[PDB]
Design a protein around this nucleic acid. Sequence first.
RNA 1: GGGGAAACUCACGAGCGCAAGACAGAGAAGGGAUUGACAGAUUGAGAGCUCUUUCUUGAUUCUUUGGGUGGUGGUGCAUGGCCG
Lengths: 144, 125, 104, 98, 53, 105, 124
Amino acid sequence: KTTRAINKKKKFVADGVFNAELHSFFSKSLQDAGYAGIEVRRTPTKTEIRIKATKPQQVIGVEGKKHKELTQFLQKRFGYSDDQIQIWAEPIKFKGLCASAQVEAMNYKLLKDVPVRLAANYIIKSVIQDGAKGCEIIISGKLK
Amino acid sequence: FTFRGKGLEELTALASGSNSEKLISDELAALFDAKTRRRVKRGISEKYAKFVNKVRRSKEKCPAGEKPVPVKTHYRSMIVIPELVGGIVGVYNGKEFVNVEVKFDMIGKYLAEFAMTYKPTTHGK
Amino acid sequence: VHVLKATKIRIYKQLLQDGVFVLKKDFEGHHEETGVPNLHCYILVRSLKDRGFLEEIFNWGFTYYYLNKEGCEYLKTKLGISADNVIPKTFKASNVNFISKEED
Amino acid sequence: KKKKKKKSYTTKKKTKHRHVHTKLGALAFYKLENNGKVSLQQKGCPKCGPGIFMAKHYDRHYCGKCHLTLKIDXXXXXXXXXXXXXXXXXXXXXXXXX
Amino acid sequence: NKLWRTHPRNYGKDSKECRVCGARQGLITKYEMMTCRRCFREQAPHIGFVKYR
Amino acid sequence: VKKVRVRITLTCKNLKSVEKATSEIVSRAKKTEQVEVKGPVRMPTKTLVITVRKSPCGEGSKTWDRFEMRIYKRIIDLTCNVPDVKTITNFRIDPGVEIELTMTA
Amino acid sequence: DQNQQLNEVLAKVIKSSNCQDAISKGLHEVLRTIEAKQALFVCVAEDCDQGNYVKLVKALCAKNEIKYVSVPKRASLGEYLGHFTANAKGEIKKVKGCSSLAIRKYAPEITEDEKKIIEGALKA
RNA sequence: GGGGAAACUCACGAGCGCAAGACAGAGAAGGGAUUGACAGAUUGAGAGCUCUUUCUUGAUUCUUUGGGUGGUGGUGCAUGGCCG
Ligand SMILES: [Mg+2]
Ligand SMILES: [Mg+2]
Ligand SMILES: [Mg+2]
Ligand SMILES: [Mg+2]
Ligand SMILES: [Mg+2]
Ligand SMILES: [Zn+2]
Ligand SMILES: [Zn+2]
């Protein structure tokens, strides 16, 4: 009998907010490999986070750095070293079909001084190539 | 030929009665409006008690040369107690301290009711 | 604000063991896992990040720090003859690499 | 577009200083008697006194730790006029240096 | 020596915060999720709030 | 025959997924011999409404966002033994789908 | 030689108990500890140019049942603890000469054979 | 401007205290860097806040010369994001 009973309303809203918490947590730290989303299956036994990325290799980390950093980091807010809160990194099959990823690719190119048009072309071509059915890019700012 | 509300003395005996414990003996209670009774019967502060004594010394030590030592306070929330009559307390409003001579009539009323908190409006344009 | 010596010790340790420390943007409360005055945890963790032994991340209501390589060197230097056989969790094991391939 | 800020400080409020705690050289609270035995100088707090000396005010006994305050009645009038006399030796010598 | 956080931040505008932005103004949406309008609108799809009004 | 009346509760944020569990839980339970199932009952769909003034700064006309989160609760009853249930719960049910169980005799 | 193992084990312990809170630093600190009978061991810098210093010290040590050893210069003490005028690099220059050290407790990572070396130089 | 302000919020006004001035160069420091504090005296206030007073405490630091944090402070005509 899990501690306190909660309005399926109240507990569900809590569920969503927690998920949106994880999203800011991951995206903000996993700002290297194509981050995408999170299939979270919560059990009063084991909270299972499944991070989907373009470069899963980056999530696991070096020696197993990030993997533990994140798993532990979660343990710090809602801990349970009982391997309860365990993380898994999924591979994003078609890189070029994930926008969350392409933006990062574009974010990288722009900070490496690759001109705008040339830039966008590469991502857009690469996106259509991967099977996109239509692609568009917007870049508002103090353009030169 | 003028007199005072309920007898300034009966109250000094009413307030400092057999059990002159809490600043406002349950006696004075029967006298105040619901709002005031509410507060005291609820949870009045102790600071309001050391402020009390500060007026005390001001009322006696001063010679009949009617020159009271102004007592300064921010406790605008204090409700004048019987023994608080006669002393001139300086009450803060927003800018400075206000000196007010406590008359018998201003009892049961909030000490703040005299420290004007804003200068109403004059006009022209 | 003084930071007790034992406070300092207790802290640097709770870190070196895990290699990770976490703190909320609150200043009155007490750090969750350690029960330490947060103000103390702030004073202590910042000198680290500042010199360069700590990495920081912030989301919603919390600051996340992961220890740095050059950091274990620092802590062990401060903890004394006790910190030498210490392997922050985040630093060694690699048991079974598991980058899951979607459902069957 | 909002009002500007500024800062005009009264010459009156001036400023105010903060305390400056002070140790005076080292502190030899003990005496050597018969160079075989050692002696005590101040008083020692009863509670936490296995090494803590109480501060002797001009009439009150204070403990840097337990804050315990003590004073003898008969010794108050005796020490009050003795401390006030030593307060004048200090009050006159302090006005001489300025 | 400090003595702040004295005043009773016990009920009302000051005893509330937005899990995220942290503000206290924006309708701190009490319905279980402490969030201001602006912030919620951002998280809506992640918390799980469709539109189709 | 140690019969235990089992209560299967399923609450979910979206209909797509909760209907699969329901549909298949029964599909699977009917097919067992030690099984007696009370039809999958659909409780009233609870809707959490959040109306929000769009723009962050209060300028421009009145714009309101009507956000909704629907929660479907389905309830299924079972006549079985304790092993029978764990036998039928062996699905591959989507995320965010809470399943609670009550056992009585 | 100045019994390398005596001075060496000393600094390894003065720094061992200092890495833990259980160490006493100062004249006021030690005199205070000595009395409480909270010092399982007290040291004294001999080349101390202060009146009655070393004296009043050894004085209390016995008067409260304390084991005690003296080290040549006060300077060598500064190091055992960690009191020099360091530098964000490690490059030191000059060091501070104590005169009063007192160990409240021995860190639990000290050897039985090293513990005996220490009691191998106790005095007044 | 989710703007229904008793405080709070709060930016505004009067008055008061905390530093959470890290990190570096140099000077200081266990023969003390520095916190705390009865008691009167001051305050709006049992704010050591301040003065008189003297005892605790342990280098968590002082000092300057740099240099940060934080800021509902300024430019929406420098800008993202969002919205009309
Ligand atoms: Mg734009
Ligand atoms: Mg208005
Ligand atoms: Mg204010
Ligand atoms: Mg800034
Ligand atoms: Mg800001
Ligand atoms: Zn004491
Ligand atoms: Zn927000």
